[PDB]
Design a protein around this ligand. Structure first.
Ligand code: 5BS
Ligand code: NA
Ligand code: NA
Length: 275
């Protein structure tokens, strides 16, 4: 337990910390006793059986004063939602394509290991200092036994796939719907229906037509078609992560270096208000 120097709360329940001897910066989540501890092991187990630079790594865990502290990989730039909040600016298409290419590679890896993240949103896509996006928060992630369906209506309402809500079976492409809602969230700062009660939105996601941009005239043909390919209400006709990595919006992404200015800006704003 005293092998880490726990520092400020990141952003919740995650803290910045330093592994005292190696000097390495880690992110530690504080989990209470009354939590569903079988679900916490399921969360840690999914993280352990993942080995990808596009998925947040698990380092270990410890008990302190009845709490379970889960040690994980620290991403210096924060979440894409933190960067949008910090700068008070939505993301331009060039930024969205680059971040979403890495997110799709994480999704591709997870789905190949027959796992559904179930909570894809800008808040759970984390960027490192270099600009590499990683999937984080496997607290609601489900495991598929074979090419099998899941029935748990779980996730966050505005980002949930219609078939998850409909209670019919669902597989890995439920995350592709969430990716589409997230792409709109990065472009507009909020997902569709964000200013409506989340239980009212849950009710209309399967009956309403697939969401589109609030101002479609500002976005390119590629970004609007990418979002259209993500938001297909019928999961059997929804594109997989492997296919979306070939879509022009993603195939044409610029390198991670184009994110340097937003990362520097967001980090400078975080540091300036800390003092
Ligand atoms: C381990 N991890 C997570 O699983 C998740 S998933 C959703 C949130 C987290 N948290 C908070 C984290 N914050 C970080 N890095 C980090 C770095 C900077 C900032 S900032 N600049 O907004 O203060 C926030 C988080 N790195 C990693 C995580
Ligand atoms: Na979500
Ligand atoms: Na929209």
């Amino acid at each position: 337990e005293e092998v880490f120097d726990v520092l400020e709360k990141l952003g919740g329940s995650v803290f910045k910390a330093i592994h005292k001897e190696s000097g390495q910066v880690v992110a530690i989540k504080q989990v209470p006793v009354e939590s569903d501890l079988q679900e916490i092991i399921k969360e840690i187990s999914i993280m352990q059986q993942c080995d990808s630079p596009y998925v947040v790594k698990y380092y270990g865990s410890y008990f302190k004063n009845t709490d379970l502290w889960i040690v994980m990989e620290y991403c210096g730039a924060g979440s894409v939602s933190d960067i949008i909040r910090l700068r008070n600016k939505t993301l331009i298409e060039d930024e969205i394509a680059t971040i979403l290419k890495s997110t799709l590679k994480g999704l591709e890896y997870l789905h190949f290991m027959r796992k559904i993240h179930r909570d894809i949103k800008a808040g759970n896509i984390l960027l490192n200092t270099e600009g590499h996006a990683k999937l984080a928060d496997f607290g609601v992630a489900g495991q598929l036994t074979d090419t099998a369906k899941r029935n748990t209506v779980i996730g966050t309402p505005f980002w949930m796939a219609p078939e998850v809500i409909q209670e019919i079976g669902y597989n890995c492409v439920a995350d592709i719907w969430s990716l589409g809602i997230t792409s709109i969230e990065m472009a507009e700062g909020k997902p569709p229906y964000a200013d409506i009660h989340p239980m009212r939105a849950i009710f209309m996601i399967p009956t309403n037509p697939p969401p589109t941009f609030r101002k479609p005239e500002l976005w390119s043909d590629d970004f609007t078609d990418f979002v259209k390919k993500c938001l297909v209400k019928n999961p059997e006709q929804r594109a997989t992560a492997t296919q979306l990595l070939q879509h022009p919006f993603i195939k044409n992404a610029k390198p991670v270096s184009i994110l340097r200015d937003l990362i520097t800006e967001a980090m400078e704003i975080k540091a300036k208000r800390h003092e």
